[PDB]
Design a protein around this ligand. Structure first.
Ligand code: HEM
Ligand code: HEM
Ligand SMILES: O=C(N[C@H](Cc1c[nH]c2ccccc12)C(=O)Nc1ccncc1)c1ccc(-c2cc(F)ccc2F)cc1F
Ligand SMILES: O=C(N[C@H](Cc1c[nH]c2ccccc12)C(=O)Nc1ccncc1)c1ccc(-c2cc(F)ccc2F)cc1F
Lengths: 442, 442
């Protein structure tokens, strides 16, 4: 009573070599040659049992933290959010902090956002794309837009004054370097010592100070932004959040967005500018060219169903997070087989989204397709741990698309849509392939 | 026939804990408790045989690459020198390129360099050492001198304009930041995905980009410096280097020299300024006082043996590169032992430089000492891998010493010469502890 195991050769390594090079081919091979969408592979010592049977998704997603803990797995972030925050925190507290972040992320907050985004994007666009035409690296240029957009939306003029978009980004990288995504199956790796940590901490500590002073002054002035929103939060204890915690929460939110949203906006534009996709590109202007030159919340939330399909397709074909994963607290039946505690269990957006019985012709970016298995899309995952950023993220992205594609016209400098570069922890179009030429529509 | 195993407290990650924190004391302990120079340890899962017996240095330094292989552990450098460049390349081509480099930093070409050096030092002192006396951190100050003076000798005026030492020391920093040291003992870590972390990327590119522009200007204005030399280098193939390689070579030349050369100038001054060591400091002054202000080539190269001994002794007692290692591609004879393929064979200068037979009372800084086992000293490595920069590196430091001590005196704000901080990958005197006060001669 246990899933088929894909045989190992270089024993102390296990499957890392193959899995590192191309995760999909490998996990596909695994599935095919084992004749099961549920299978176990090995990273170093660690057993890892994967779920690429969409018919099984619920099994991974639905069970309680009691049965599968996302903590022992994501404690690789702990340098970045700080001790006793998020997965460091105890379950109830972890759960609690997450709600606080969600509530500051619900639609209600959004009404001001749509113009805010448009303002930044245009600002960047006019500021950074000044000719009738020119050459830009889309992914790079996109990313700045994403970081600017979030801040406009989530921080206050006061904060922006003490924390300019560009510099917030650098701060965030610094922590980023502290991470070894390897340890997610190998913690003692977490135990190894890294120089980066120093920079991460400096950066992290430094930030707080900026927060502090901003906070303190605000108190004296006595605001509706995320931070402020976060402060007013209170636990089931009835205790307020600490300035450590408020930093960690901000940071998580900042972290999740920067790459993942930025990547998706890029993937989406790359597809639409592709001549082969021109029909799809046209069926977009059908949707957005009658719009005001000042987009409104409704335009995007309720009046933009096509693009959402695009943005979703992008995320289906090229999920930026290949794996979501848990530790197994107790044996839980999945499919025929049973999984013992001690196993990293893990479900893949990558493997699951390429499932022929669920997404036939999976490398084909067909926006108007739908899953053909129930809950076989998991780009924002599912269950308790379903994304609490998707609405904001999607909103952000749609606004961006409409804005850029209203004024500017783009040509990809390549025969084909760039390949995925799988060598980063968040997976994106290959950086050097993302050179695009724009032409001012005007 | 196997070197003995130093026993294993923790199976998951071996000795990296102790070795990490204090390497010398650990290796010595191994060496003693095991009653052998040659002994094996466990990092990650991986076996690591250390040839710690100066009598056997030739057995580690003489086999050819295709037997004891350097590349399989310097993979952490591929992004910095670049793909297919240096260790990235195959061994015969690697050879070619390194020979190209050596041919650049050979005593033949050193003519103009000393005045070049003196100028920069005399330049530097004025910009910082203004008062009749004052307070400095040595390491940061030798750090600046080593890098300033390298770019003077090694780059010609036009490059200097487009790229000055302060800025170029910046680029190096970013790339250096990119490195993960755990990756030497576990290079497989680089197979699995990693955070993006590439200012370095920008850095290599900016450097490459800049050089590129420079070549055109020269080519353009034909109607030389180091860069000049690489641009005439021809392979046995008959080709010449790509910009990509040319660039990767300059990155090699500075990167190598910055910390090592710097530690040594600093370690040496600390030793020489120390109240105890006057005997030598004075002896050096004898050596250094027959000298006109404007030092020349002959002066440093052939009129400074004492200074040279001081410098070697510093390296000897405290080498900046603790350990070098290859990958055992096929078993090798080491003394009574045979070391099986797969192992990371390593040879440690720190360890070697503290073998009691070869250097008596090792922690004592004795410039007039002499290796009582031949070739004990490996601070510049040996055999097929002798450091190709030593002559330049010695000339560089010697000149600084001869320049600095003549117009200054120094005192160190501790009873003892600083400790070595073994936490960085290049190992130098503990940063804070290197605090000094100086006074002009007259
Ligand atoms: C394109 C954008 C995004 C993608 C593709 C994405 C993807 C995902 C996925 C797959 C999960 C499920 C994790 C699991 O089940 O283990 C998830 C959860 C989550 N995401 Fe996102 N996400 C995005 C944006 C955001 C943003 C902007 C935030 C900002 C707060 C955010 C915060 C979170 C949080 C807090 C969770 C749940 C953590 C937990 O419950 O353990 N995400 N996201
Ligand atoms: C105190 C100063 C220096 C020390 C202690 C030092 C030390 C060493 C050591 C120990 C090796 C052998 C490493 C091994 O076995 O893998 C070596 C090799 C080398 N060093 Fe240095 N070095 C110094 C300065 C320089 C400088 C200034 C350069 C400038 C280009 C340089 C370039 C090299 C190169 C190219 C090698 C090639 C080794 C090979 O063939 O694989 N070094 N150095
Ligand atoms: O970067 C990663 N995760 C971070 C951090 C994170 C985890 N829980 C979060 C909740 C909120 C915010 C951030 C995080 C993030 O920002 N994830 C995120 C973003 C948005 N929503 C949910 C999650 C990450 C990327 C890759 C891997 C990985 C490693 C492998 F060996 C192989 C394949 C892989 F894919 C592991 C990772 F941990
Ligand atoms: O930082 C390192 N190497 C860089 C870059 C570099 C590598 N190959 C080169 C050849 C020529 C020029 C530069 C380099 C450098 O500048 N080395 C250098 C400089 C001058 N000469 C020779 C070499 C470095 C330092 C320590 C360790 C190490 C530490 C341990 F605990 C145990 C075992 C180890 F091995 C590993 C390292 F990779």
């Amino acid at each position: 009573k246990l899933p088929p195991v894909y045989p190992v050769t270089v024993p102390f390594l296990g499957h890392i070599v193959q899995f590192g090079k191309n995760p999909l081919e490998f996990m596909q091979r695994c599935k095919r040659d084992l004749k099961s969408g549920v299978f176990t592979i090995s990273i170093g010592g660690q057993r890892v049992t994967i779920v690429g049977d969409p018919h099984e998704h619920s099994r991974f997603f639905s069970p309680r933290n009691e049965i599968l803990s996302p903590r022992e797995v994501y404690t690789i972030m702990t340098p970045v959010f700080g001790e006793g925050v998020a997965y460091a925190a105890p379950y109830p507290r972890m759960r609690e902090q997450l709600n606080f972040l969600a509530e500051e992320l619900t639609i209600a907050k959004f009404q001001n956002f749509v113009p805010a985004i448009q303002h930044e994007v245009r600002k960047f666009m006019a500021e950074n794309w000044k000719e009738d035409e020119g050459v830009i690296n889309l992914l790079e240029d996109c990313g700045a837009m994403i970081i600017n957009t979030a801040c406009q939306c989530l921080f206050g003029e006061d904060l922006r004054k003490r924390l300019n978009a560009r510099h917030f980004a650098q701060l965030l990288s610094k922590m980023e370097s502290s991470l070894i995504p390897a340890a997610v199956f190998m913690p003692w790796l977490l135990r190894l010592p890294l120089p980066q940590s120093a920079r991460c901490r400096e950066a992290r500590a430094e930030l707080q100070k900026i927060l502090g002073e901003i906070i303190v002054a605000r108190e004296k002035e006595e605001t509706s932004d995320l931070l402020g929103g976060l402060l007013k939060a209170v636990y089931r204890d009835g205790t307020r959040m600490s300035l450590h915690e408020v930093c960690g929460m901000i940071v998580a939110a900042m972290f999740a967005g920067q790459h993942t949203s930025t990547i998706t906006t890029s993937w989406s534009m790359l597809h639409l500018m592709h001549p082969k996709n021109k029909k799809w590109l046209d069926k977009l202007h059908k949707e957005i060219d009658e719009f005001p030159a000042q987009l409104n919340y409704d335009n995007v939330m309720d009046e933009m169903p096509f693009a959402e399909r695009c943005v979703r397709e992008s995320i289906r074909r090229d999920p930026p997070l290949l794996m979501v994963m848990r530790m197994v607290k107790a044996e839980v039946k999945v499919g025929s087989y049973v999984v013992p505690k001690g196993d990293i269990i893990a479900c893949s957006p990558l493997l699951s989204h390429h499932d022929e019985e669920a997404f036939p012709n999976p490398r084909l970016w067909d926006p108007e397709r739908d899953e053909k298995v129930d809950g076989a899309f998991i780009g924002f995952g599912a269950g308790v741990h379903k994304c609490i950023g998707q609405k904001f993220a999607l909103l952000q992205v749609k606004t961006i698309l409409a804005t850029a594609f209203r004024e500017y016209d783009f040509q990809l400098l390549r025969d084909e849509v760039p390949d995925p570069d799988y060598h980063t922890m968040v997976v994106g179009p290959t950086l050097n392939q993302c050179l695009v030429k724009y032409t001012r529509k005007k």
